[PDB]
Amino acid sequence: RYRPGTVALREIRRYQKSTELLIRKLPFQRLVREIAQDFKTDLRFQSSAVMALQEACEAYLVGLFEDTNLCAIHAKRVTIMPKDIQLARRIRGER
Amino acid sequence: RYRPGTVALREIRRYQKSTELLIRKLPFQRLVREIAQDFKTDLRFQSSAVMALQEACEAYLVGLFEDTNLCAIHAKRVTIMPKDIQLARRIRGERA
Amino acid sequence: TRSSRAGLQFPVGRVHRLLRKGNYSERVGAGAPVYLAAVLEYLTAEILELAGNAARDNKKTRIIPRHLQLAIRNDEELNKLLGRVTIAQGGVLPNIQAVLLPK
Amino acid sequence: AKTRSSRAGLQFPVGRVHRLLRKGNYSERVGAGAPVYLAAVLEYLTAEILELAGNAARDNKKTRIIPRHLQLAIRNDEELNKLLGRVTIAQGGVLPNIQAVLLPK
Amino acid sequence: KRHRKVLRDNIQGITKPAIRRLARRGGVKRISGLIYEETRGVLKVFLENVIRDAVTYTEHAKRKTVTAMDVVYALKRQGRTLYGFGG
Amino acid sequence: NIQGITKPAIRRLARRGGVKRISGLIYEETRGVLKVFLENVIRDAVTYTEHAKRKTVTAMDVVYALKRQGRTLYGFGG
Amino acid sequence: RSRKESYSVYVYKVLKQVHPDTGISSKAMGIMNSFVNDIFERIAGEASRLAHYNKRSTITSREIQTAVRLLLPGELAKHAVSEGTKAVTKYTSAK
Amino acid sequence: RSRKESYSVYVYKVLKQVHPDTGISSKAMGIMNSFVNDIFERIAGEASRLAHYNKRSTITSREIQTAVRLLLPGELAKHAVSEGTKAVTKYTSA
DNA sequence: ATCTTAGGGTTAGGGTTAGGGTTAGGGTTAGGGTTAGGGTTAGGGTTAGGGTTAGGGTTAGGGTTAGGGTTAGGGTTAGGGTTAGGGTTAGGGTTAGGGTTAGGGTTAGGGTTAGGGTTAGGGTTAGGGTTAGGGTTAGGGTGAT
DNA sequence: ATCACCCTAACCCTAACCCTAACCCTAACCCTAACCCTAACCCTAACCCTAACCCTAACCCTAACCCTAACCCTAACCCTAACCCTAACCCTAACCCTAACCCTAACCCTAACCCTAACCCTAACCCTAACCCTAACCCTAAGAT
Ligand SMILES: [Mn+2]
Ligand SMILES: [Mn+2]
Ligand SMILES: [Mn+2]
Ligand SMILES: [Mn+2]
């Protein structure tokens, strides 16, 4: 049995060292068609159009988790909380 | 004698409801010409060019003090520290 | 005038000249300056409305930049549209963080 | 020499650059020197990126430059990182960095 | 030749393990329980904004198919310029 | 001249920013941040002045620099 | 000297139309002119790119349309598109 | 179909001059072409505005140069201006 | 809360400035009419996205133990804040010179237009190497005795 | 502080897939000539910037005091990591078809070119109301009984 934080630190090193997408492709494609179709019906997506979106989302989210962690560390915490995501988005001017 | 944090809160209300520039015009104009000479010698400035810069600086700084305070409050503090200005500037993407 | 024909105060004539002069495209449609002048006039009207109301509130008759600032930052949509713009002599909106407020 | 790229001593296409400037709606006219200067700047910067990326390909033991390499090269150079600061390299990944505060005692 | 399937609750497709992985690349040591629904909220807003603009481009092109370029053009607008999918 | 932007002038800017209390190290940090802001804007403004083959930095040169910096200013000509 | 343009004449007209008993300061008008120029460029530039993307040599009311849809807010774009379509229709009516 | 342009041919040339024993992936080249196009439009657009501001119809090497000076980091800009001035001079010679 | 204390918005007075009603003519925009091509038509190829079948194995969902990080407390030090009084330096009030920006005219040449010419490079096919994925290998650092 | 076991890193090679060198043919850039309006020179107006003087007085700084916020340490809970296993559902390589895209031939009207014409808007002036500046005033909490 590993101590709490060990597998966690190992995971950071694992995923930081790679490029593979981290969300599953079909669940993500469904979310895209859902959101899109519920703005304009009978839309088609080029396979790459969805991939371009997924790359964008994950790049966005990972960079947000960076600022989020900076905020949790700022408040002398180790664990990220909604108030950190919120402050990062506030300062980023996303509101 | 007013309690610590009373004149301070009153000051926020004063300057928040105001628009006048808060830096003195001549000390500011000097800083501008100083920085400029370090860029190109014998430069002239239109009166308005300096005013445009001052308006820009103060607008920038006030908005930075807003994010800074948000950071101080985030860390359960009331008073702003360099680490707050730094975090505001990092998340703003001004800093690394 | 073309502005008269479209029922606008804003200049259709000028807008057309600024579009082809401005290096946006080889050609400009007959409707493009009309639609643009209309949008520009609408947004001018929207700002002047809220600002004039804020000027009215300040016991004032003339709109000053403060009024434009209060109007812009109090509207969610104008604040978004002019979110990365600074109104010279505008000031800030009054807002004290509740955490700072006394006991 | 015969191509305009040959005359300017460039690998990048002066010919194409001129066409793209004219057909891109930037100005009524384009100077003879403008596409030459631009092709040169574009070629310089691609040489600068390819240099650092090829070096990172060589460390990761690879023969071929993949987007990871372009990402490591971009984000490890202060100036390229600034130039491409609001750009996303698809399949680039992140730079490895754990905050020292998180590290064990 | 006939009717498609209704699409609902697909934000739950962005699972807790998938969200953890994104936080690990972001270099996060520990994750609160409320983070998962919050990331879902933030991701939905991000996609709504991008897809809205992409679909506006598709529509302008008088097309039914959202292309990689439409997504690329949308991201550039959002100030999230993407390399690799054309342009 | 960087010391011309005094501790009281900096406190006023923090009050408009809605700050209740200010650390002692803030004054020298604001000075650092303000100098960077001006260096960046004036550098670009002077680059415009220079392109115009002018000696005099105009309001427009400052306006053009700010737009570039993504700090668009309303009221100085453009 | 040399001639200087302005939206002054129109801003005053539109003001006389919304607030017939309200005036405007030299600086407030400065801000109004700065505002008109910024949005003109924002829309004209977006429309310039739209025509370009779609390999089309002309900027039409359709390019202005979707630029407004891209640049304006949730409800302002709704009304601006209405006011624009209204102006064009009225113009097409009057020779 | 319809023909599609690319900086592929040149990126490969500039790669061989720099690292003659290194290759490039289909995607990495995708990123390189995206890079060339972005900076082309960043410089061309800035130069377009410069000529506009100064009431000039033409974009010259002078508009390209101050655009580079405005958009590039200090030292990249320093070398790009050198690289550029060199190319123009050589071109004017030939 | 009830006691004195400051200060800031309130009322009214009457000064100063700059809004906005005004003059003229300059240059912008409009209605004439010709000219050319961009873009609107209908059509077919032809690519390709959506939907389907298929399977199996990764990856997920859910509950379980307990570490160990989060957040309340109290109790220490000192850092900024109020207030004060001496006093540097800022802000107008109001001069003159002259380098600067630049209107405007004369003229040359750089940048465009044109069609034929041909060379570069896009899109085609295809052989072999670099990378990938499955087998065990050892050391490596982890966390219990 | 010693030994156990889970891990990643890294060796082996077999494995495929993607790179890059080949083919060629299509299409863009290149050469040339005459084209013109831009931007180059030139002189020199009339603009506005900097330079130097004055008078306090609003404003900054040192050095008065004590409030209470920040920081450390501790010890309360309980949130959230790590691990296990079952079964969904993703990924995979297929299959197919038709809507969707877009080529490329035909056509016409929209858009630009030109000139001259009225007509709008800029630059200017000058008046006067809105706003500013000052002193006395009530409201309104502020800190201590
Ligand atoms: Mn502990
Ligand atoms: Mn102290
Ligand atoms: Mn020539
Ligand atoms: Mn090829």
Side-chain angles (χ1 to χ4, degrees), chain H residues 1-10 13 58 60:
Chain H
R1 269 173 90 206
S2 70
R3 306 293 241 258
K4 312 207 178 300
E5 302 255 294
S6 216
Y7 289 96
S8 300
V9 168
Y10 325 99
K13 275 180 165 80
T58 80
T60 69

Side-chain angles (χ1 to χ4, degrees), chain E:
Chain E
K1 59 120 162 260
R2 100 253 118 165
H3 192 216
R4 335 118 162 176
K5 173 61 114 65
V6 50
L7 276 166
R8 315 139 65 205
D9 212 20
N10 285 298
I11 199 73
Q12 300 294 310
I14 313 309
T15 62
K16 162 185 193 164
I19 289 158
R20 288 187 152 269
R21 290 198 275 272
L22 295 156
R24 297 290 194 243
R25 198 165 270 168
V28 169
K29 199 183 160 182
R30 208 172 186 111
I31 298 146
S32 180
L34 310 150
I35 289 289
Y36 309 110
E37 244 335 306
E38 192 82 6
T39 303
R40 281 182 192 111
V42 169
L43 172 69
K44 213 195 186 129
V45 172
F46 183 89
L47 274 180
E48 283 160 354
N49 283 113
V50 180
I51 296 158
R52 186 188 296 116
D53 280 22
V55 171
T56 310
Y57 283 118
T58 310
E59 274 197 291
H60 196 254
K62 280 156 169 162
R63 280 194 272 97
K64 289 228 196 191
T65 314
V66 177
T67 71
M69 282 305 231
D70 298 330
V71 168
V72 156
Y73 293 149
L75 292 160
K76 197 169 150 217
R77 258 221 88 246
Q78 297 309 313
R80 318 262 336 155
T81 317
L82 179 76
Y83 281 4
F85 290 87

Side-chain angles (χ1 to χ4, degrees), chain B residues 49-65:
Chain B
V50 177
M51 291 310 282
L53 275 157
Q54 205 178 349
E55 283 295 324
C57 277
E58 293 200 40
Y60 168 75
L61 288 180
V62 169
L64 184 68
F65 277 128

Side-chain angles (χ1 to χ4, degrees), chain A:
Chain A
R1 163 137 270 184
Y2 288 116
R3 294 180 86 199
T6 314
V7 179
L9 279 152
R10 198 157 72 219
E11 279 175 7
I12 292 152
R13 304 205 192 96
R14 166 169 167 176
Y15 295 110
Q16 277 196 337
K17 229 81 181 173
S18 51
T19 85
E20 16 94 329
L21 292 160
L22 305 173
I23 296 173
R24 277 91 60 258
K25 290 188 190 192
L26 185 63
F28 187 90
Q29 190 176 78
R30 275 199 250 97
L31 186 54
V32 164
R33 307 185 176 276
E34 188 197 292
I35 292 165
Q37 144 217 78
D38 283 338
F39 273 119
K40 209 259 174 82
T41 50
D42 271 297
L43 284 170
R44 290 194 147 208
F45 278 96
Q46 288 194 320
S47 61
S48 61
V50 176
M51 292 310 282
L53 272 156
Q54 203 180 350
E55 284 290 350
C57 277
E58 291 199 39
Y60 168 74
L61 288 180
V62 169
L64 184 67
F65 277 128
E66 286 178 346
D67 305 351
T68 298
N69 201 51
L70 275 268
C71 289
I73 303 162
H74 184 76
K76 316 103 62 243
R77 283 182 280 102
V78 158
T79 142
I80 57 160
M81 285 176 160
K83 61 194 211 163
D84 306 309
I85 291 178
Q86 285 163 32
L87 180 72
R89 290 188 77 245
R90 235 243 228 203
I91 299 162
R92 266 169 162 233
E94 290 175 11
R95 225 96 131 188

Side-chain angles (χ1 to χ4, degrees), chain H residues 6-73:
Chain H
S6 216
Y7 289 96
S8 300
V9 168
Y10 325 99
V11 173
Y12 243 99
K13 275 180 165 80
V14 170
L15 168 58
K16 307 279 100 196
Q17 289 185 298
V18 173
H19 288 108
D21 274 33
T22 302
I24 201 175
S25 88
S26 192
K27 300 169 172 122
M29 178 61 80
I31 285 130
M32 288 310 290
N33 240 283
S34 295
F35 169 71
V36 190
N37 286 319
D38 172 28
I39 309 299
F40 178 103
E41 76 210 5
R42 283 198 214 182
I43 303 162
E46 188 55 68
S48 167
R49 247 167 268 129
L50 276 160
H52 266 127
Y53 295 156
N54 297 294
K55 287 145 230 75
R56 271 134 172 92
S57 300
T58 80
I59 285 164
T60 69
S61 21
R62 187 158 195 278
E63 274 77 88
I64 306 296
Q65 192 178 286
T66 125
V68 164
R69 279 230 175 82
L70 291 163
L71 293 144
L72 284 223

Side-chain angles (χ1 to χ4, degrees), chain B residues 1-8 10-11 13-14 17 23-27 30 42 44 79 81:
Chain B
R1 189 139 159 241
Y2 288 116
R3 292 175 78 201
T6 312
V7 179
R10 198 157 72 219
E11 279 176 6
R13 304 206 224 283
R14 167 170 166 176
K17 281 144 214 71
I23 296 172
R24 276 91 60 257
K25 291 187 192 191
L26 186 62
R30 278 199 302 266
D42 201 327
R44 296 213 205 273
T79 143
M81 285 176 161

